[PDB]
Subunit: 75 residues, 10 copies
């Protein structure tokens, strides 16, 4: 039982690494939004909803990591 609990806790820590991908990805989307609006201010209403979509889909990959993390810690 000591070994299994220990393994759950190391596994939980490892499971958060993947979150770096969403941290970077979310930023890449918003950088594009900002550069896109600076170059063509009139496009704002068109690209803003695209940024929201991109951020959310990128963020979901981190959510999956965090889900495994919580399953290990509790489930």
């Amino acid at each position: 039982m000591q070994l299994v609990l220990a393994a759950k806790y190391i596994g939980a820590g490892i499971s958060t690494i993947g979150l770096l991908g969403a941290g970077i990805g979310i930023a890449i989307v918003f950088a594009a939004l900002i550069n896109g609006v600076s170059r063509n201010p009139s496009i704002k209403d068109t690209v803003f909803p695209m940024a929201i979509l991109g951020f959310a889909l990128s963020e979901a990959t981190g959510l999956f990591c965090l889900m495994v993390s919580f399953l290990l810690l509790f489930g």
Copy 2:
């Protein structure tokens, strides 16, 4: 059996690392969509389906990681 079970749990956590690739990739697709539409608004209906295709294929790679994670967990 303790050691094997422990290995499954460590393995399950390792199996999520690869999801960082979909995290970045999905974003790269949407960044190109935003930049391409900003430079050429009239191209939006043409490239939007390309971004959806691109994002879905990038995501699938991460979903295959998660699948191995759940195989190990359960």
Copy 3:
């Protein structure tokens, strides 16, 4: 319980790796803000709130990593 405690502490350290994503991502958003405003000074009031939103969403991924780290350390 030595093995489990040992695992909590190593797991806590591992759980901070993911914070490199927010460190890079936050910077990516601000670099876009700077470049966007340099190319088009008049867009500042428009893109500054987008940069704030972008920072916060990227930052959140780091918060989730640090949350797991502290759970392993203390909770």
Copy 4:
């Protein structure tokens, strides 16, 4: 025997890491497709099959990782 089975499961988890390369690469190809079509709409029919090829070849690297992963699991 706990050791061998354990190693199979840890090994399978490690084997998914490389999938991050396909997650990013697939995205890089579709980003270029999107940027390329936005700058030159008339080029779409020429570059689209190139992007399909690029995706498939990048994706195959991920299939190889998954193959080793399943070999270890089963």
Copy 5:
């Protein structure tokens, strides 16, 4: 106790890895400041405070890592 102590030291070393994000991120912000000012010198006074804010927020992620490090050490 020796095993737990060992773990604290290993964990403290692992906890510094994430500082590489701040190392790169601080530099990304300063690169943008430099390129921004070079292309448009008149914008210096506007973008400099933005660069201070950006690098401070990026560096704080590294400080959160170093904090866990020092929690494990002391």
Copy 6:
């Protein structure tokens, strides 16, 4: 013998990590082909063979990884 066998399986999983380089690299080559052709359609016939050569040389690095993998497995 069990320990050596365990090591072969762990090593085989570790040996697939380097395939991410090919995943990204193949995609970098195709991105350049797409952007190159979009900017200058007339150059297609010249740059396409260069892209085949480039992706083949990039993918071979991944194949060298997979070879070590299969040496350890079989």
Copy 7:
């Protein structure tokens, strides 16, 4: 006690990894300095101190890694 000392030495080695962030970041700042001066020579006196600041702040992240490394070694 072999365990604690061992952990100090492994931990110290791990603690240097983050230095890669300063190696890349320092380079990113100087690249921007170089590109910025090439595009606008008259801006040199304004951007050079900014690049010194950027280097120093990126470098400090590496100093923090090394600090933990020496704390573990001694």
Copy 8:
């Protein structure tokens, strides 16, 4: 000698990680060749041999990794 053999095999696997550098780098050189020739077709005969040199020097780093891998495996 079980422990030493085990270590040779894990070490061999680890030694292939470095090959991702050549995989990315080789591609970076060829992408520049393609982009360079697209922008200036007449420069092809000049830059093609530079791309060949670049590929070979990047590739060599991968050769060194594979050399250690095979030394661990066989030598």
Copy 9:
């Protein structure tokens, strides 16, 4: 004493990972030098000393990794 000695050797190898940062960073500096000189030949004597400074600072980060490696080895 066997375990401690073993830890030093594993540690020494881990301590070299961070050199990848100087490997990339040195290159980033020289890439900017080449591109800046190509676009503005007359700026060469001004930026060349900047590249030498940039490369040396980037390299130092890797040299600090190697230093920890040799401390552990000997």
Copy 10:
């Protein structure tokens, strides 16, 4: 003695990871050379020696990794 030899062999494998940096870096230099020559063919004789310098300094970082590798394997 089993433990120390095993450690030397794992350490040797780990020591080659850093080579990926030179693999990528060498390529970054040559990509710049190629793009620089495509844009300004007349600059070739000036930038080629700079590429050689950059490649060599980048390559030396991989050499340092490989040195530790060989010290572990033999020394």
